[PDB]
């Protein structure tokens, strides 16, 4: 039944991430319409910092967000993070008028508010998803970001065409509040707290989670930081984020500067890879859960297979993108194929935090994001320093580096990953 309580939560989280990512993306396309050459005379560096200061706040509140979510539950953290994002987005037109400093402060506040949503959602699923249904539920929850980017890219441009650029922020921000009103009303942080959950569904979920939750009184920080299986996930996530920062920022820039294709202006062709990623995310979660449920594959084997696919497969196409030459059509094809194969990581390492320690998945995902958000802020300078002459060979070297990092991460995860609850997560 589609209207079951846990899938209702999954759909609501899907739309929450859709809204948050649409809010995040629409700035990148409203900016080009408001900058000069009233219009604001911000150069390339000022625009880059306006865009990138979000992550300097996004990084900070990952581990604290996970810890607080494990202590009190994720409902309020997620709801208020997304509400803060929306409300602060509503003020972007004013902050732009005060000046660069106020706007960078606003973006940093958005990042701080938004840092807790992912660890909070993991800590929320640690109480809602039965072990043999995590792949479906988490995939449905996190495909919202992909669909949000897909819908935000063209619709914001349409709004700017028919309305002033401020209405983009107004529209998405008010939709954020209208979603928060549903989140406050329809969702609870645990099945025992749910107001409408049927008796047998609660019994089913609690019975499924009965022997995986922890009896411990306090977080095992030392075991968490000492466990090799966690560092396997960290190494996988860092490599994945580096590879996809490359794929979705540098490769479009490669097409812009070397091939002169200007994909950023086309719009729809830019959203195509995200649509493919959304569809593959959902279907690879479905297939990954079926493999564990019906065919009786070991969880670790499924994680290994899907991580190897979703990491190594994109590497080959990313490397090929440097050899395609003047044909930008096949460059777009490789971008789309790589971003589509990227969906398997939604059932690969991206879920393994719950697998190795469900009771502390919030903290584990907080640590993993704290490590994996670094590439999104170190890549700009690396690319700037690796392509001084801006020729095909330098971009080929950049793609070689990205593919090498991706393959090393995939191999490390394959070697050192685990798919069963660690003993340090069960009892003192």
Numbering used by the authors: 34 to 70, 99 to 489
Text of the article:
Sialin, a member of the solute carrier 17 (SLC17) transporter family, is unique in its ability to transport not only sialic acid using a pH-driven mechanism, but also transport mono and diacidic neurotransmitters, such as glutamate and N-acetylaspartylglutamate (NAAG), into synaptic vesicles via a membrane potential-driven mechanism. Sialin (SLC17A5) belongs to the solute carrier 17 (SLC17) transporter subfamily that includes nine related transmembrane major facility superfamily (MFS) transporters, all of which are dedicated to anion transport, including the vesicular glutamate transporters 1-3 (VGLUT1–3) and a vesicular nucleotide transporter (VNUT). Sialin adopts a classical MFS fold consisting of 12 transmembrane helices (TMs) with two pseudo-symmetric domains: N-domain (TMs 1-6) and C-domain (TMs 7-12). The Sialin structures in both the lumen-open and cytosol-open conformations reveal a solvent-accessible cavity, which forms the substrate translocation pathway, at the center of the interface between the N-domain and C-domain.
Moreover, we determined the cryo-EM structure of the SialinS61A in complex with Fab10B8 at 3.2-Å resolution. The structure of SialinS61A is in a lumen-open state. The interaction between Arg57 and Arg168 is disrupted, instead, Arg168 forms the salt bridge with Glu171, which is consistent with our observation on SialinR168K. These findings support our hypothesis of the hydrophilic interaction network in the luminal leaflet to modulate the conformational change of Sialin. Indeed, the S61A and R168K mutations confine Sialin in the lumen-open state, indicating the importance of these residues in regulating the conformation of Sialin. To functionally test these interactions, we mutated Ser61, Tyr306, Leu309 and Tyr335 to alanine individually. As a result, the sialic acid transport activity was considerably reduced, indicating that these residues play critical roles in the transport cycle. The lumen-open structure reveals that the hydrophilic interactions between Arg195 on TM5 and Gln273 on the cytosolic helix, Ser196 on TM5 and Arg353 on TM8, Lys197 on TM5 and Asp350 on TM8 seal the substrate translocation pathway from the cytosolic space.
